[PDB]
Tab-separated table of C-alpha atoms in Angstrom:
chain	number	residue	atom	x	y	z
A	1	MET	CA	42.802	13.104	-18.624
A	2	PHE	CA	40.517	11.914	-15.807
A	3	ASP	CA	40.567	13.068	-12.165
A	4	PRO	CA	39.345	10.605	-9.474
A	5	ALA	CA	39.383	13.315	-6.799
A	6	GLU	CA	37.383	15.825	-8.869
A	7	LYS	CA	34.724	17.660	-6.857
A	8	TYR	CA	31.616	19.557	-7.938
A	9	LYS	CA	32.283	23.254	-8.491
A	10	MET	CA	30.859	24.704	-5.272
A	11	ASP	CA	32.091	28.301	-5.566
A	12	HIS	CA	29.018	30.026	-7.030
A	13	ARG	CA	27.599	33.141	-5.330
A	14	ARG	CA	24.799	31.242	-3.559
A	15	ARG	CA	24.672	27.638	-2.332
A	16	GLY	CA	21.125	27.183	-3.603
A	17	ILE	CA	17.598	26.661	-2.342
A	18	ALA	CA	16.782	24.085	0.325
A	19	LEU	CA	13.111	23.378	-0.337
A	20	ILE	CA	11.119	21.667	2.412
A	21	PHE	CA	7.594	20.269	2.184
A	22	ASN	CA	6.338	19.470	5.666
A	23	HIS	CA	3.125	17.448	6.000
A	24	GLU	CA	1.620	16.886	9.460
A	25	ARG	CA	-2.155	16.598	8.936
A	26	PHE	CA	-4.059	15.294	5.908
A	27	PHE	CA	-7.458	15.581	4.224
A	28	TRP	CA	-9.963	13.520	6.224
A	29	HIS	CA	-11.117	11.205	3.419
A	30	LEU	CA	-7.535	10.007	2.846
A	31	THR	CA	-7.631	8.186	6.212
A	32	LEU	CA	-3.995	9.014	6.994
A	33	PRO	CA	-2.703	9.325	10.585
A	34	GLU	CA	-1.318	12.652	11.825
A	35	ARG	CA	2.473	12.767	11.666
A	36	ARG	CA	3.617	13.888	15.116
A	37	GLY	CA	7.027	15.561	15.295
A	38	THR	CA	7.513	16.426	11.624
A	39	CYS	CA	7.656	20.088	12.601
A	40	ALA	CA	10.572	19.052	14.816
A	41	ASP	CA	12.159	17.373	11.776
A	42	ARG	CA	11.429	20.447	9.656
A	43	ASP	CA	12.958	22.872	12.177
A	44	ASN	CA	15.950	20.532	12.545
A	45	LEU	CA	16.626	20.441	8.780
A	46	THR	CA	16.113	24.204	8.400
A	47	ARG	CA	18.718	24.819	11.109
A	48	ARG	CA	21.250	22.432	9.562
A	49	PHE	CA	20.894	23.474	5.915
A	50	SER	CA	21.055	27.173	6.849
A	51	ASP	CA	24.437	26.689	8.538
A	52	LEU	CA	25.462	24.981	5.292
A	53	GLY	CA	24.475	28.193	3.481
A	54	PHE	CA	21.191	27.103	1.887
A	55	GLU	CA	18.231	29.419	1.429
A	56	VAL	CA	15.637	27.346	3.271
A	57	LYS	CA	12.045	27.736	2.065
A	58	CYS	CA	9.441	25.870	4.142
A	59	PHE	CA	5.871	24.932	3.227
A	60	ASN	CA	3.410	23.276	5.603
A	61	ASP	CA	0.516	20.968	4.681
A	62	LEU	CA	0.260	22.319	1.117
A	63	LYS	CA	-2.434	20.871	-1.170
A	64	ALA	CA	-1.528	19.133	-4.446
A	65	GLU	CA	-2.033	22.288	-6.551
A	66	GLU	CA	-0.069	24.602	-4.241
A	67	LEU	CA	2.764	22.084	-3.963
A	68	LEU	CA	2.980	21.636	-7.760
A	69	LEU	CA	2.884	25.417	-8.244
A	70	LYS	CA	5.808	25.929	-5.861
A	71	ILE	CA	8.204	23.231	-7.160
A	72	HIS	CA	7.596	24.300	-10.747
A	73	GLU	CA	8.152	27.898	-9.636
A	74	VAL	CA	11.450	26.833	-8.031
A	75	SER	CA	12.485	24.750	-11.059
A	76	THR	CA	11.945	27.686	-13.432
A	77	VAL	CA	13.909	30.172	-11.305
A	78	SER	CA	17.552	30.734	-12.315
A	79	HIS	CA	20.036	28.566	-10.413
A	80	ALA	CA	22.932	29.866	-12.540
A	81	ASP	CA	24.558	31.528	-9.519
A	82	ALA	CA	23.907	28.509	-7.261
A	83	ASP	CA	25.972	25.458	-6.258
A	84	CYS	CA	23.209	22.882	-6.049
A	85	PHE	CA	19.569	22.204	-5.177
A	86	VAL	CA	17.962	20.444	-2.207
A	87	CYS	CA	14.351	19.302	-1.944
A	88	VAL	CA	12.906	17.544	1.104
A	89	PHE	CA	9.586	15.737	1.510
A	90	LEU	CA	8.224	14.950	4.950
A	91	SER	CA	4.946	13.053	4.497
A	92	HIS	CA	3.407	9.629	3.851
A	93	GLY	CA	4.621	7.738	0.788
A	94	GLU	CA	3.172	4.717	-1.007
A	95	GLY	CA	5.443	3.253	-3.699
A	96	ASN	CA	6.539	5.970	-6.115
A	97	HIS	CA	4.131	8.503	-4.590
A	98	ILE	CA	4.431	11.224	-1.987
A	99	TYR	CA	1.356	12.633	-0.239
A	100	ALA	CA	0.195	16.228	-0.263
A	101	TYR	CA	-2.642	17.369	2.020
A	102	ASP	CA	-5.408	16.198	-0.333
A	103	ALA	CA	-3.867	13.685	-2.761
A	104	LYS	CA	-0.759	11.740	-3.747
A	105	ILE	CA	1.738	12.748	-6.432
A	106	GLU	CA	4.259	10.641	-8.387
A	107	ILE	CA	7.827	11.421	-7.303
A	108	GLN	CA	9.205	11.452	-10.864
A	109	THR	CA	6.657	14.143	-11.751
A	110	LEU	CA	8.370	16.324	-9.128
A	111	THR	CA	11.999	15.313	-9.759
A	112	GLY	CA	11.561	15.329	-13.547
A	113	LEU	CA	11.274	19.124	-13.389
A	114	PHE	CA	14.969	19.444	-12.545
A	115	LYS	CA	16.295	17.230	-15.345
A	116	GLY	CA	18.896	18.683	-17.746
A	117	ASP	CA	16.258	19.405	-20.399
A	118	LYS	CA	13.778	21.360	-18.247
A	119	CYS	CA	16.114	23.034	-15.751
A	120	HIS	CA	19.134	24.255	-17.721
A	121	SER	CA	20.711	26.329	-14.917
A	122	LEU	CA	21.207	23.168	-12.810
A	123	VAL	CA	22.939	21.062	-15.485
A	124	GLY	CA	26.074	19.488	-13.996
A	125	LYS	CA	25.068	20.588	-10.493
A	126	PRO	CA	23.927	18.262	-7.680
A	127	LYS	CA	20.179	17.786	-7.287
A	128	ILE	CA	19.515	16.288	-3.879
A	129	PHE	CA	16.120	14.914	-2.878
A	130	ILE	CA	15.362	13.680	0.629
A	131	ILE	CA	12.277	11.500	1.035
A	132	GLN	CA	10.986	10.783	4.533
A	133	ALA	CA	8.025	8.548	3.718
A	134	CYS	CA	6.822	5.270	5.261
A	135	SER	CA	10.692	-2.573	-0.985
A	136	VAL	CA	10.044	0.052	-3.668
A	137	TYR	CA	11.602	3.391	-4.636
A	138	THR	CA	11.866	5.420	-7.845
A	139	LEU	CA	15.200	5.570	-9.693
A	140	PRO	CA	17.035	8.954	-9.819
A	141	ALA	CA	15.761	11.116	-12.696
A	142	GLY	CA	19.178	11.643	-14.300
A	143	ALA	CA	22.830	12.611	-13.946
A	144	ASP	CA	23.805	14.497	-10.781
A	145	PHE	CA	20.625	13.371	-8.987
A	146	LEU	CA	20.885	12.088	-5.433
A	147	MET	CA	17.897	10.437	-3.773
A	148	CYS	CA	17.931	9.955	-0.007
A	149	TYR	CA	15.396	7.594	1.553
A	150	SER	CA	14.441	7.137	5.197
A	151	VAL	CA	13.042	3.635	4.601
A	152	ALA	CA	10.836	3.916	7.709
A	153	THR	CA	8.973	10.398	18.727
A	154	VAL	CA	7.924	13.990	19.496
A	155	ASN	CA	11.493	15.223	18.915
A	156	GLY	CA	11.372	13.878	15.347
A	157	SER	CA	12.159	10.672	13.462
A	158	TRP	CA	15.378	8.659	13.791
A	159	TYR	CA	16.434	9.290	10.193
A	160	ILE	CA	16.153	13.093	10.361
A	161	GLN	CA	17.641	13.374	13.860
A	162	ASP	CA	20.580	11.184	12.846
A	163	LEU	CA	20.919	12.943	9.480
A	164	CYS	CA	20.911	16.374	11.131
A	165	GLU	CA	23.392	15.344	13.836
A	166	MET	CA	25.820	14.230	11.122
A	167	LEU	CA	25.016	17.293	9.013
A	168	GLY	CA	25.779	19.502	12.023
A	169	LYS	CA	28.996	17.702	12.932
A	170	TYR	CA	30.461	16.731	9.548
A	171	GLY	CA	28.359	18.610	6.946
A	172	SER	CA	30.933	21.344	6.293
A	173	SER	CA	33.887	18.962	5.839
A	174	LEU	CA	33.026	15.370	4.856
A	175	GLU	CA	32.024	14.197	1.380
A	176	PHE	CA	28.235	14.031	1.242
A	177	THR	CA	27.870	10.301	0.469
A	178	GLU	CA	30.406	9.607	3.251
A	179	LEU	CA	28.165	11.513	5.653
A	180	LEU	CA	25.058	9.719	4.369
A	181	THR	CA	26.848	6.396	4.873
A	182	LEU	CA	27.402	7.472	8.498
A	183	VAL	CA	23.657	8.039	8.878
A	184	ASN	CA	23.095	4.452	7.706
A	185	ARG	CA	25.247	3.278	10.621
A	186	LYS	CA	23.682	5.610	13.220
A	187	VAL	CA	20.179	4.359	12.385
A	188	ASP	CA	21.484	0.784	12.452
A	189	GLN	CA	22.644	1.289	16.069
A	190	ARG	CA	19.105	2.164	17.218
A	191	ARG	CA	18.195	-1.544	17.163
A	192	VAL	CA	18.947	-2.589	20.755
A	193	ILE	CA	22.497	-5.028	14.430
A	194	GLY	CA	22.962	-5.017	10.645
A	195	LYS	CA	20.169	-7.534	10.036
A	196	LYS	CA	17.149	-5.401	9.048
A	197	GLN	CA	16.456	-2.572	6.562
A	198	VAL	CA	18.222	0.743	7.182
A	199	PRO	CA	17.998	4.130	5.419
A	200	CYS	CA	19.219	4.245	1.835
A	201	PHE	CA	20.580	6.551	-0.855
A	202	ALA	CA	20.639	6.192	-4.637
A	203	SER	CA	23.435	8.158	-6.289
A	204	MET	CA	23.630	9.285	-9.891
A	205	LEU	CA	26.290	11.805	-8.856
A	206	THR	CA	29.362	12.120	-11.079
A	207	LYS	CA	31.780	13.937	-8.762
A	208	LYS	CA	32.662	14.317	-5.070
A	209	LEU	CA	30.279	16.592	-3.163
A	210	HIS	CA	31.422	18.828	-0.308
A	211	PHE	CA	29.812	21.744	1.513
A	212	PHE	CA	32.914	23.703	2.541
A	213	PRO	CA	32.077	27.098	4.113
A	214	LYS	CA	31.798	29.939	1.592
B	1	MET	CA	32.855	7.009	20.305
B	2	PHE	CA	32.136	7.181	16.559
B	3	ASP	CA	34.681	6.964	13.722
B	4	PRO	CA	33.849	8.714	10.401
B	5	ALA	CA	36.809	7.076	8.645
B	6	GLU	CA	35.949	3.546	9.811
B	7	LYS	CA	36.348	0.921	7.086
B	8	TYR	CA	34.917	-2.578	6.737
B	9	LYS	CA	37.206	-5.234	8.185
B	10	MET	CA	38.786	-6.614	5.003
B	11	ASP	CA	41.499	-8.815	6.531
B	12	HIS	CA	39.802	-12.230	6.472
B	13	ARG	CA	41.561	-15.228	4.876
B	14	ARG	CA	39.587	-14.987	1.619
B	15	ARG	CA	38.051	-11.974	-0.129
B	16	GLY	CA	34.872	-13.893	-0.949
B	17	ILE	CA	32.955	-15.280	-3.897
B	18	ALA	CA	32.291	-13.208	-6.998
B	19	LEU	CA	29.232	-14.892	-8.467
B	20	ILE	CA	28.391	-14.167	-12.103
B	21	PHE	CA	25.213	-15.140	-13.948
B	22	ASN	CA	25.740	-14.561	-17.659
B	23	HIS	CA	22.690	-14.769	-19.945
B	24	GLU	CA	23.153	-14.567	-23.726
B	25	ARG	CA	20.312	-16.583	-25.272
B	26	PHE	CA	16.800	-17.188	-23.939
B	27	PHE	CA	13.959	-19.709	-24.212
B	28	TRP	CA	12.191	-19.140	-27.533
B	29	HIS	CA	8.683	-18.483	-26.176
B	30	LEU	CA	9.983	-15.574	-24.061
B	31	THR	CA	10.574	-13.545	-27.253
B	32	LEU	CA	13.771	-11.974	-25.905
B	33	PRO	CA	16.600	-10.810	-28.208
B	34	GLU	CA	20.042	-12.424	-27.966
B	35	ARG	CA	22.441	-10.365	-25.870
B	36	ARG	CA	25.562	-9.947	-27.990
B	37	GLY	CA	28.784	-9.271	-26.092
B	38	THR	CA	27.737	-10.375	-22.604
B	39	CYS	CA	30.440	-13.019	-22.717
B	40	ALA	CA	32.801	-10.101	-23.279
B	41	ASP	CA	31.333	-8.414	-20.195
B	42	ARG	CA	31.552	-11.672	-18.252
B	43	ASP	CA	35.205	-12.248	-19.140
B	44	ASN	CA	35.946	-8.597	-18.318
B	45	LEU	CA	34.412	-8.829	-14.832
B	46	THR	CA	36.075	-12.196	-14.111
B	47	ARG	CA	39.467	-10.693	-14.954
B	48	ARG	CA	38.894	-7.611	-12.781
B	49	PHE	CA	37.416	-9.324	-9.719
B	50	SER	CA	40.153	-11.993	-9.777
B	51	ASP	CA	42.890	-9.351	-9.539
B	52	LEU	CA	40.884	-7.999	-6.604
B	53	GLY	CA	41.198	-11.458	-5.041
B	54	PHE	CA	37.664	-12.788	-5.540
B	55	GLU	CA	36.873	-16.416	-6.268
B	56	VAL	CA	34.965	-15.917	-9.506
B	57	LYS	CA	32.295	-18.514	-10.282
B	58	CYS	CA	30.601	-18.160	-13.687
B	59	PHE	CA	27.334	-19.654	-14.915
B	60	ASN	CA	26.014	-19.292	-18.451
B	61	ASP	CA	22.382	-19.325	-19.572
B	62	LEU	CA	21.195	-21.179	-16.459
B	63	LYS	CA	17.484	-22.016	-16.181
B	64	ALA	CA	15.380	-20.712	-13.268
B	65	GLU	CA	15.806	-23.903	-11.193
B	66	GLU	CA	19.565	-24.200	-11.712
B	67	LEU	CA	20.055	-20.500	-10.941
B	68	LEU	CA	18.003	-20.710	-7.729
B	69	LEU	CA	19.891	-23.860	-6.692
B	70	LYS	CA	23.262	-22.138	-7.114
B	71	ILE	CA	22.553	-18.860	-5.275
B	72	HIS	CA	20.973	-20.731	-2.383
B	73	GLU	CA	23.976	-23.064	-2.407
B	74	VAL	CA	26.291	-20.029	-2.238
B	75	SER	CA	24.174	-18.338	0.462
B	76	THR	CA	24.337	-21.434	2.686
B	77	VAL	CA	28.104	-21.851	2.330
B	78	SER	CA	30.257	-20.418	5.141
B	79	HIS	CA	31.524	-16.895	4.455
B	80	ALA	CA	33.025	-16.641	7.958
B	81	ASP	CA	36.565	-16.479	6.551
B	82	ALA	CA	35.568	-14.021	3.797
B	83	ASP	CA	35.606	-10.219	3.472
B	84	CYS	CA	32.447	-9.728	1.427
B	85	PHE	CA	30.200	-11.137	-1.287
B	86	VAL	CA	29.651	-10.100	-4.904
B	87	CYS	CA	26.866	-11.232	-7.202
B	88	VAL	CA	26.479	-10.117	-10.821
B	89	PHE	CA	23.503	-10.494	-13.172
B	90	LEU	CA	23.949	-10.019	-16.910
B	91	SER	CA	20.522	-10.492	-18.518
B	92	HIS	CA	17.238	-8.769	-19.391
B	93	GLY	CA	15.364	-7.150	-16.501
B	94	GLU	CA	11.777	-5.905	-16.265
B	95	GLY	CA	10.958	-3.925	-13.114
B	96	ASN	CA	12.011	-5.898	-10.047
B	97	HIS	CA	12.755	-9.025	-12.109
B	98	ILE	CA	15.829	-10.533	-13.692
B	99	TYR	CA	15.578	-13.110	-16.475
B	100	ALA	CA	16.915	-16.640	-16.402
B	101	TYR	CA	16.940	-18.749	-19.579
B	102	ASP	CA	13.298	-19.848	-19.231
B	103	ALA	CA	11.586	-17.423	-16.833
B	104	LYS	CA	11.928	-14.264	-14.759
B	105	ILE	CA	12.750	-14.119	-11.051
B	106	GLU	CA	12.136	-11.372	-8.471
B	107	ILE	CA	15.409	-9.738	-7.412
B	108	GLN	CA	14.482	-9.599	-3.721
B	109	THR	CA	13.970	-13.375	-3.817
B	110	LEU	CA	17.652	-13.631	-4.741
B	111	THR	CA	19.058	-10.849	-2.527
B	112	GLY	CA	16.848	-11.828	0.418
B	113	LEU	CA	18.944	-14.990	0.799
B	114	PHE	CA	21.919	-12.963	2.062
B	115	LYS	CA	20.058	-10.937	4.702
B	116	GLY	CA	21.326	-11.038	8.305
B	117	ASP	CA	18.723	-13.639	9.301
B	118	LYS	CA	19.388	-16.232	6.595
B	119	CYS	CA	23.109	-15.748	5.974
B	120	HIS	CA	24.721	-15.323	9.390
B	121	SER	CA	28.346	-15.565	8.176
B	122	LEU	CA	27.931	-12.372	6.125
B	123	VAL	CA	26.462	-10.209	8.902
B	124	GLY	CA	28.276	-6.855	8.966
B	125	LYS	CA	30.054	-7.661	5.701
B	126	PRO	CA	29.388	-5.922	2.355
B	127	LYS	CA	26.939	-7.658	0.013
B	128	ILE	CA	27.394	-6.207	-3.452
B	129	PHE	CA	24.948	-6.908	-6.275
B	130	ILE	CA	25.545	-5.716	-9.827
B	131	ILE	CA	22.521	-5.660	-12.128
B	132	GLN	CA	23.063	-5.184	-15.859
B	133	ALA	CA	19.472	-5.276	-17.089
B	134	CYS	CA	17.590	-3.072	-19.571
B	135	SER	CA	12.321	4.228	-13.742
B	136	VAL	CA	12.066	1.273	-11.348
B	137	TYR	CA	14.491	-0.651	-9.136
B	138	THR	CA	14.203	-2.713	-5.951
B	139	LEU	CA	15.476	-1.252	-2.663
B	140	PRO	CA	18.544	-2.929	-1.049
B	141	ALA	CA	17.522	-5.899	1.124
B	142	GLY	CA	19.164	-4.638	4.336
B	143	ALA	CA	22.248	-3.239	6.066
B	144	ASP	CA	25.576	-3.574	4.213
B	145	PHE	CA	23.789	-4.200	0.884
B	146	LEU	CA	25.017	-2.363	-2.195
B	147	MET	CA	23.018	-2.459	-5.407
B	148	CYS	CA	24.679	-1.359	-8.640
B	149	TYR	CA	22.474	-0.680	-11.663
B	150	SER	CA	23.481	-0.197	-15.293
B	151	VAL	CA	20.262	1.691	-16.124
B	152	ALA	CA	20.616	0.771	-19.804
B	153	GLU	CA	19.552	3.112	-22.614
B	154	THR	CA	28.760	-3.434	-28.887
B	155	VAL	CA	30.574	-6.750	-29.444
B	156	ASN	CA	33.271	-5.778	-26.925
B	157	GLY	CA	30.600	-5.441	-24.231
B	158	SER	CA	28.296	-2.771	-22.816
B	159	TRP	CA	29.335	0.741	-21.771
B	160	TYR	CA	28.533	0.178	-18.110
B	161	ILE	CA	30.644	-2.974	-17.728
B	162	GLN	CA	33.545	-1.675	-19.838
B	163	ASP	CA	33.640	1.561	-17.858
B	164	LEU	CA	33.133	-0.256	-14.555
B	165	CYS	CA	35.963	-2.689	-15.362
B	166	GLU	CA	38.323	0.064	-16.526
B	167	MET	CA	37.823	1.840	-13.193
B	168	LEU	CA	38.041	-1.459	-11.312
B	169	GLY	CA	41.352	-2.220	-13.037
B	170	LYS	CA	42.780	1.250	-12.471
B	171	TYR	CA	41.440	2.247	-9.043
B	172	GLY	CA	39.894	-0.944	-7.608
B	173	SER	CA	42.768	-1.746	-5.268
B	174	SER	CA	43.040	1.774	-3.802
B	175	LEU	CA	39.895	3.928	-4.042
B	176	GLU	CA	36.813	3.630	-1.826
B	177	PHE	CA	34.220	1.562	-3.683
B	178	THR	CA	31.419	4.168	-3.880
B	179	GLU	CA	34.068	6.684	-5.017
B	180	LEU	CA	34.962	4.342	-7.866
B	181	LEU	CA	31.302	3.747	-8.697
B	182	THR	CA	30.748	7.512	-8.806
B	183	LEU	CA	33.587	7.650	-11.361
B	184	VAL	CA	31.729	5.098	-13.489
B	185	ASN	CA	28.707	7.417	-13.434
B	186	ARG	CA	30.875	10.132	-14.993
B	187	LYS	CA	32.556	7.846	-17.559
B	188	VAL	CA	29.183	6.667	-18.883
B	189	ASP	CA	27.978	10.282	-18.900
B	190	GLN	CA	30.853	11.227	-21.247
B	191	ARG	CA	29.694	8.705	-23.872
B	192	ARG	CA	26.939	11.115	-24.956
B	193	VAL	CA	28.645	13.050	-27.760
B	194	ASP	CA	26.042	12.262	-30.442
B	195	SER	CA	26.829	17.379	-27.328
B	196	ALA	CA	25.485	18.320	-23.887
B	197	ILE	CA	26.250	15.865	-21.064
B	198	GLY	CA	24.626	15.417	-17.640
B	199	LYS	CA	21.081	15.699	-18.998
B	200	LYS	CA	19.902	12.073	-19.345
B	201	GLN	CA	19.829	8.957	-17.114
B	202	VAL	CA	23.191	7.465	-16.138
B	203	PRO	CA	24.097	4.301	-14.201
B	204	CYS	CA	23.138	4.264	-10.526
B	205	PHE	CA	23.975	2.701	-7.173
B	206	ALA	CA	21.861	2.329	-4.029
B	207	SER	CA	23.942	2.075	-0.854
B	208	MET	CA	22.905	0.626	2.472
B	209	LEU	CA	26.578	0.335	3.409
B	210	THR	CA	27.578	1.429	6.913
B	211	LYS	CA	31.351	1.836	6.527
B	212	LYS	CA	33.989	2.729	3.933
B	213	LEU	CA	34.775	-0.103	1.523
B	214	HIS	CA	38.261	-0.698	0.106
B	215	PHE	CA	39.853	-3.602	-1.767
B	216	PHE	CA	43.482	-3.189	-0.691
B	217	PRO	CA	45.718	-6.088	-1.837
B	218	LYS	CA	45.895	-8.976	0.639
B	219	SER	CA	49.422	-9.280	2.056
């Protein structure tokens, strides 16, 4: 017995936490340019994920310690009565690293916290990570992981604007990878096509993912 | 005007070439173990992609030169009357490298040949690469690229290919391709009974696709 149309069980009490790390300015000695319009991206995502029923928790220009303290805190909270988990990073990113205010951090250090072993209450539930960071990327940490990459302007970046537009229009009906595929096309249209690098998503998901209204 | 249900145009004369590089034995001084049952995987994929209408071209234990000559040859052929392109690598793989018989080759060197600039007759058409090679992977080369990874952790073949081919045989001619690939992720996840599932690394796919992809029978 095997069902091709089988969806994730999305009928828990809460949808889950939408965690957002927004980085605009950086420690001087890192020599990293200010990221104009990330607050626009952050507000845009908050809006969209809230209408999808997420509990959006925002954090601005956190230092490496404070960031690590918060994700671990979130990973050790009970998600038993939650559908899924969403984490977003809006910063600079070199290779397999994301940048905090003062230093860089390996992505798999962050995503590894939500693996089946460490985060039991999220086993079998979608774990979505969105990485908006300027050809390398780190492979999803395990089953039911979904990595979304921007693969990189005062109103925000193309990826987030186009993601949020689709999230706002189709988020509560379409299958999530369908919607993400649509973003790939929207960003491809900006080139005024289908010749250069667009946004990307790596899926270790095992079922269909929908965000039908609760 | 924007269509969420829009599919790739899959009504060209031919489906396209399914290119398979099967590596079983390796040059001695590479110190790489023989890959038992890759010929089983190779035969399995040939079977499946043929029923899907692909022109399957197989190459066994090719050396770095011969491999590079063939992919370039395939990339410079006209795909104007083709739906899409499929390339499969069955070998050992360290980081962003795949192994030929004698040496390793960067994946993006291979996939870069089918980018919009170099391969004009495949612009806007799906370019599917399947990598069966023992957490790093190289990002898809551009729009309409789809990378499929085994993420390996057995004489009839490997779990990934068996499970992929089973799904290809059962749902290949009807389901959307990423749907089907998602199903493979679940099938490989079930294998862990030696028990709790959905805890460890499963197979993966990175999609730069821009439309829905179906392999409906050509009539």
